[PDB]
Curated annotation (Swiss-Prot), chain A:
Descriptive protein name: Large ribosomal subunit protein bL9
Highest taxon of the lineage: Bacteria
Full-sequence range covered: 1 to 63 of 173
Entry similarity comment: Belongs to the bacterial ribosomal protein bL9 family.
Disulfide bond entries: none
Function according to Swiss-Prot or TrEMBL: Binds to the 23S rRNA.
Gene encoding the protein: rplI
From Swiss-Prot, chain B:
The protein's name in its UniProt record: Large ribosomal subunit protein bL35
InterPro entries, alphabetized: Ribosomal_bL35, Ribosomal_bL35-like, Ribosomal_bL35_CS, Ribosomal_bL35_sf
Disulfide bridge positions per record: none
Pfam families xrefs: Ribosomal_L35p
Spans traversing the lipid bilayer: none
Any single Gene Ontology cellular-component annotation: cytosolic large ribosomal subunit
Ribonucleoprotein as UniProt keyword: yes
Any GO MF annotation of the entry: structural constituent of ribosome
SUPFAM superfamilies for this protein: L35p-like (SSF143034)
GO biological process: translation
Source species: Borreliella burgdorferi (strain ATCC 35210 / DSM 4680 / CIP 102532 / B31)
From Swiss-Prot, chain C:
GO aspect biological process, one term: translation
Organism listed in the record: Borreliella burgdorferi (strain ATCC 35210 / DSM 4680 / CIP 102532 / B31)
NCBIfam families linked to this entry: L28
Protein name as it appears in the record: Large ribosomal subunit protein bL28
Family the entry assigns: Belongs to the bacterial ribosomal protein bL28 family.
SUPFAM superfamilies noted in UniProt: L28p-like (SSF143800)
Length: 63, 66, 91
RNA sequence: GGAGAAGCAAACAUUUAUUGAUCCCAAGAUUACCGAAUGGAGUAAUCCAGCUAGCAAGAUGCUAGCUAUCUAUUAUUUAAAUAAUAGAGGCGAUACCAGGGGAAGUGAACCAUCUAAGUACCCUGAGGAAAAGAAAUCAAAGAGAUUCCCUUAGUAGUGGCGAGCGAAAAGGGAGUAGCCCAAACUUUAAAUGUGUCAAGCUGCAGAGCGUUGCAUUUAUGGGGUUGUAGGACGUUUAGGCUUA
RNA sequence: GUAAUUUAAAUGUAAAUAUCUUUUUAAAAUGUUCCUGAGUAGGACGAGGCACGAGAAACCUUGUUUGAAGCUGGGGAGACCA
RNA sequence: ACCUGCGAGUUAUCAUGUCUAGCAAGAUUAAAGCAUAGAAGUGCUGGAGUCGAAGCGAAAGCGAGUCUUAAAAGGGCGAUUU
RNA sequence: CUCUAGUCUGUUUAAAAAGGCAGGGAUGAGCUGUGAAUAGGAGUGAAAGGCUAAACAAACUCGGAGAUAGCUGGUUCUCCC
RNA sequence: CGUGAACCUUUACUAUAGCUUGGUAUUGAGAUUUGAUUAAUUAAUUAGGUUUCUAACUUAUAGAAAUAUGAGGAGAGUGCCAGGU
């Protein structure tokens, strides 16, 4: 399952990234807990546009 | 057409008809262990033969169309 | 029944066919069918819980592993819409 | 329709009918109780109610009218709960059709493959026909939706190659009819998310920094349906104007 | 009674005509982009239907798994390849 | 038990043989249509298909020859005398 | 009031399982009325291949079914070669 | 006697309920060394062995449900395939 991370993870990626994860990991943990969202149109595109325009950069994480 | 007589397929695959009645067939005993059989015996078994006139009526019953 | 509540999959009835002998594609003279019996192939339903943030609560549905896979692929709302069912029919 | 009528047969003594009866047809009324039976319950044809109206109504009084359930559509936080209409329950065809379940007696002179056979039967659905039906097809012929016949043909193949099972195409007929969504874009918004800049608009100018900024879902209209055509882009166009 | 004709107030079933309802209020016309149906096509295993019993066994449906392309495409032409 | 009634090689199609009728190297239409009639007819229309007219060889293929074979060299199955 | 060893009648009987004599139990593993539960490759059985609507080594009814039989029986007027 | 029928038994034949084993889906994240293979002890995969955390999943209580709490656990259970009985 390709998923888009609403936050950061140790081995996965940053908020806004998309990664392939095992389906159980995605469905039972990330999706219900809110750590990530399904990589669909009307969700992935909206999140990416909002992150690039309203967010536009790491919130002090890089520094 | 409701009741067309069915041919006997296992007989069709072994019998053949000549133009004026006789039945052609392939001789037996040339399918299997062959080293012991004499050469002239095998040569005669190769060539095809005709059945005795006593079976022709039954065969004509078995092959209603052919 | 053993029925996927989304797609409508149900168990499928068929035969039980034993075979004796060795297939020709393995050098054997062939195979022979034995005594066929009756049998059933069963869907593997799962009584899954989907947490829906949209109303902040979990809904339990009988779905097959195939439907679970498809939900993971497409998204639960879209899949329900495609099979013309609505989440409120559950609960 | 015209002279009898009081059923299916007359009898025995009573009336009606020329004031148009009886009877036939059409419509309407009446239409007890049980029964899908549905207020609850129940040993089917019957006891027990809730509420309203009238019986002096009243002490287990009588009569009339409502309160069963499922599904779809919304009046709401369609789940809970009632409310609103709409469509169903069952019977009938010891017929036909579709879907699901699916034998056994036999033949193979046994039997276990096979055959019988998708047969009987069971169950779920409706219809007057049903099913199917407008090629990601047949198939090496140039045809052109689906179905039903005549032929192909007991042929091609299949089968402990045993018994058996058994096409299709083409051709000749009956009968004829082709179409409509989604998606590609756009309008009207709502709901849910996210967003404070150059996000909308055919293109010059002024206004303009959020015509909700961009998306998804719901609802409405335009747009369109195929040997890859339909939209955004390319022009003549665009009846003609009002609106933008 | 029969032939050939012929009774319709009312009711039921049929067409046709307008009414009514709805739609087009336009088409012939070149190339760039967008879409053209997704757990679907296909493959592995287990079954069934095709006349066709795994047989070289296509193809279709289908249970358990896996899994695509996007016309610069895909399916079919009885294993398969061109 | 007697007596009287009832009480078993039929029908539908295919193969093959014979008889009858007709045509003849040809014979024959099936489904279906039209016309008249109302008279589940019978007069036409309809040649798609089948059986003969060439067989032999597993087949390709060749043909009064063909196959077995270097060989009509001898035979097997044909025919020239339907 | 419930049961049937032994014997007899009966056995084209009054009774498709009795009766005439007798015997066992008889305060209990008791008898019995009135309702209900267990249905066929199953039930039940203090256990005999018992019972389950007078028939049970797999109940009954309907349908498949006119099942299949190398078995038995039957197969109708006459004459000629 | 009939290539009759039924029942029963068995270390007769052939299937099969049920039982059992393995793999896979359900089924995730950790830690560790047992190795094999591929190249250059290192690196990329992969079967496992010993363990861990709970969010999947399932046990106890309350509740109509939702939900909560206390314990197990990616095991088990249930499908499919294969191996035994």
């Amino acid at each position: 399952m390709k998923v888009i991370l609403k936050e950061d993870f140790i081995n996965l990626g940053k908020e806004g990234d998309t990664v392939e994860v095992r389906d159980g990991f995605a469905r039972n943990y990330l999706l219900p807990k809110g750590f990530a969202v399904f990589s669909n149109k009307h969700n992935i595109e909206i999140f990416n546009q909002k992150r690039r325009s309203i967010l536009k950069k790491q919130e002090a994480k890089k520094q | 057409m409701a009741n067309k007589m069915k041919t006997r397929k296992s007989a069709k695959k072994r019998y053949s008809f000549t133009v004026n009645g006789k039945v052609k067939y392939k001789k037996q005993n040339l399918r299997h262990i062959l080293t012991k059989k004499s050469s002239k015996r095998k040569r005669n078994l190769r060539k095809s033969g005709n059945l005795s006139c006593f079976e022709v009526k039954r065969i004509k019953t078995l092959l209603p169309y052919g | 029944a053993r029925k996927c509540e989304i797609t409508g999959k149900k168990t499928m009835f068929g035969n039980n066919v034993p075979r004796k002998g060795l297939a020709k594609k393995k050098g054997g003279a062939g195979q022979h069918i034995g005594v066929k019996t009756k049998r059933t192939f069963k869907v593997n339903l799962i009584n899954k819980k989907f947490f829906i943030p949209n109303l902040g609560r979990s809904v339990s549905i009988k779905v097959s592993a195939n439907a679970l896979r498809s939900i993971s692929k497409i998204g639960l709302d879209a899949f329900l819409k495609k099979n013309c069912k609505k989440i409120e029919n559950f609960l």
